[PDB]
Structure 1
């Protein structure tokens, strides 16, 4: 009966079950029924808006990006599928129904001993941990090792969401909300390492560039919506699209970027009183820092800089896919939502487009190489799920196939590529240590 009720809860959707969870939390906080109902329905309001705008992103950008990818290069054989094609594949795994209870238990345990302050409530993003566990099970061949991998990934994701609280609170303005899930969370340490390296280099640190500089230089034409329209038009032109298609796509890009914050806003409007009462009661009873709430990484698309970088990086990603040595994966699926990769990079760089570009280039190269490395495991997963054609063609993805955590876990658990494991582990360990030191320093400075 547990599997059936878990499947029902999953099928309820983020727009129904999450408002129920928020209402229950508010009721546990001793509020009036009206406030809890309003907060829940507002959160559902924002999430429905997010889903609609993301669907617009997909059906507007996907076709154009894919057409440009075919037009540019044909050397790369393996074709990316991205998160829209990976998440249903992941949900068909045999551990898809136990990963959610395991993650919930580990979150409760880490909250009980005050090792974290992130109360994750988005259970539709647990498929990341499910994917890592499935890959570990496929590679090593042991169920217990897969469970250990899921636990490790969940703990690391929660700790990373805790560490990046300052950037979400300040740069994005999402006060009281933390984002532990998504590709932005675990690609943060690379951006932190790149920022530290650039800061160390004299002369290069003097280069500053932001959308505000663009607006100042170009007058009324530098206003962000104009630059988004221009980027959409350029992407349409590069894809060989017709004039009417180019204009429609550019208008769609400007529209999605303009409407992202308008649909995010109801979530904050509904969650403000909940956070206020939480800080009023739970912080008084227990103590410590603010109790953050985990949410979907789609909330990071509200900032104009994030979506601007997303539009800019599609041709940049396609260019990177040709120059990266030992690369066979052609970015095909998540090019529409490539902003999820470099959102935390933009937040860390505080909108500095030069350092954002450098960090995004390095992140794209690293994730493309990793996705090239993890192909046999991914095609084995595809065969296991049954969503694979009979031609025997390989498959790969970058949203979760190329995550550094999964590659590091698999390499450390089976030791098949020691040189790549050593290199990626050194880079990611330096990034993690740097981001932890930076988070501790920021917390100490804010406290003092």
Structure 2
């Protein structure tokens, strides 16, 4: 019974199921049915528009970035299929369906114990937890260890959405919204560690370069739209595109950056009365701070600095992949939405594109090395899901193949690479401790 119900709910999508969940929550909050329905349909509309602009990204910058990647003479044989290739592969796994109830049960358990405030409703990003569990299952060979990996990933991402709540509220303006999923949430700790290290270092901490600085320096050509147009021009030129294709891609990138906030605005409009009623009634009933709603990481693309970093980092990601030692993954499928990796890095640095560039370089290097490490597990995952081609080419990805959580869990439960496990674990544990202390300090400051 459970299987087809979960499949139906997943197939409904964020467009339909998420408004249904929001309407149910609003009705449970004793709101008028008209307002509840209006908020629900507004959230559905916002997610439809998000899908439209994300498809525009994947269909315009996607092929352009891939053409740029192949254009440069490279020795990276394995291609990064990205989340467009990882997510269908992950949803075809054995534990794919049970991951949704496992993640929801974990979220509920941590909510009742007041270990988190993130009420995750975006169940279509539980394919990340599913990916972690599937790779653990492939490596160790134990179903119980796969479930343990799913539970650990879910708890970690909920706590990350809790810790980066201040950044989404202040920098991104998504008040009452957490972003626990995506690469941004679990690559944020690396950004926090880099920011702390830079602040410790004299001289480098003084270097500041925000998008507002670009605007003030370049006048009317420093607007976010002009930056997106110029970045699209650069991408098209590097990709070997013709002048017509270059200009069309440039206008499409500028349109992406102008239209992400516009299509994300309906979600905020729908959720604002819901959040107000929640903080009025449920927060008072249960005490503590207001509960956050966990949503898609595509909301982070509303910020213009995030889209600017997304456009800038495509050539930077390819250059990093060439530079990074012991890397065999060529970033192919994740290049279209490479801003997901550095979305939280921008927020941590308050939009400082210098610090953002440093953190993004570190993050991309780490993710590419981790993807190189998990090439074998990802190929086995493709073979299990049936997506492996006849030639048996190696499969690797950066959205989830390069996730530090998955690699750390696999190494901890297998110990196949002691030195790499120690290094990545030390770096990520320091990042986690730093981001937890940072969130605790921000909460203390807000309370005072």
Q: TM-score with structure 1 length normalisation?
A: 0.99
Report Cα offsets for 1:277-313 as digits up to 9, x if no partner: 1011011111001110000000000110000000000
Partner of 2:386: 386
Contact 2:178-2:295 at 8 Å conserved across structures: yes
How far did residue 224 of structure 1 move? 1.5
For residues 38-187 of structure 1, what are the structure 2 equivalents within 5 Å? 38-187=38-187
Contact 2:74-2:322 at 8 Å conserved across structures: no
Report Cα offsets for 1:73-131 as digits up to 9, x if no partner: 23111111000011000000111110000111111111011111110001100000000
How far did residue 392 of structure 1 move? 1.4
Q: Which moved more, 1:403-412 or 1:206-215?
A: 206-215
Q: Secondary structure at the match of 1:396?
A: coil
How far did residue 446 of structure 1 move? 0.9
Report Cα offsets for 1:360-395 as digits up to 9, x if no partner: 000010100000000111100100001111111111
Contact 2:224-2:257 at 8 Å conserved across structures: no
How far did residue 2 of structure 1 move? 1.0
CA RMSD between the two structures = 0.6
Partner of 2:199: 199
Partner of 1:229: 229
**1:30 maps onto 2:45 in alignment:** no
- Following TM superposition, the consecutive aligned residue runs of length 4 or more in structure 1 with deviations greater than 3 angstroms are none
Q: Which moved more, 1:71-80 or 1:345-354?
A: 71-80
Give aligned pairs, total. 448
Report Cα offsets for 1:240-287 as digits up to 9, x if no partner: 111100010001000111010000001111111110110110111110
CA distance in 2, matches of 1:224, 1:416: 46
Q: Secondary structure at the match of 1:204?
A: coil
Report Cα offsets for 1:216-255 as digits up to 9, x if no partner: 1111111111111011001101111111000100010001
Q: Secondary structure at the match of 1:293?
A: strand
CA distance in 1, matches of 2:417, 2:19: 45
How far did residue 445 of structure 1 move? 0.8
5+ residue gaps, structure 1: none
CA distance in 2, matches of 1:190, 1:231: 26
How far did residue 13 of structure 1 move? 1.0
CA distance in 2, matches of 1:219, 1:200: 33
CA distance in 2, matches of 1:374, 1:185: 20
Contact 2:23-2:39 at 8 Å conserved across structures: yes
CA distance in 2, matches of 1:73, 1:428: 33
Report Cα offsets for 1:115-168 as digits up to 9, x if no partner: 111100011000000000000011000100100110011000100100000000
CA distance in 1, matches of 2:11, 2:226: 39
Report Cα offsets for 1:6-32 as digits up to 9, x if no partner: 111111111001100100111111111
CA distance in 2, matches of 1:443, 1:221: 38
How far did residue 206 of structure 1 move? 1.0
Q: TM-score with structure 2 length normalisation?
A: 0.99
Q: Which moved more, 1:100-109 or 1:67-76?
A: 67-76
Report Cα offsets for 1:320-339 as digits up to 9, x if no partner: 01110001000000100000
Q: Secondary structure at the match of 2:388?
A: coil
CA distance in 1, matches of 2:284, 2:223: 45
Report Cα offsets for 1:26-73 as digits up to 9, x if no partner: 111111110101000000010000000000001000111111111112
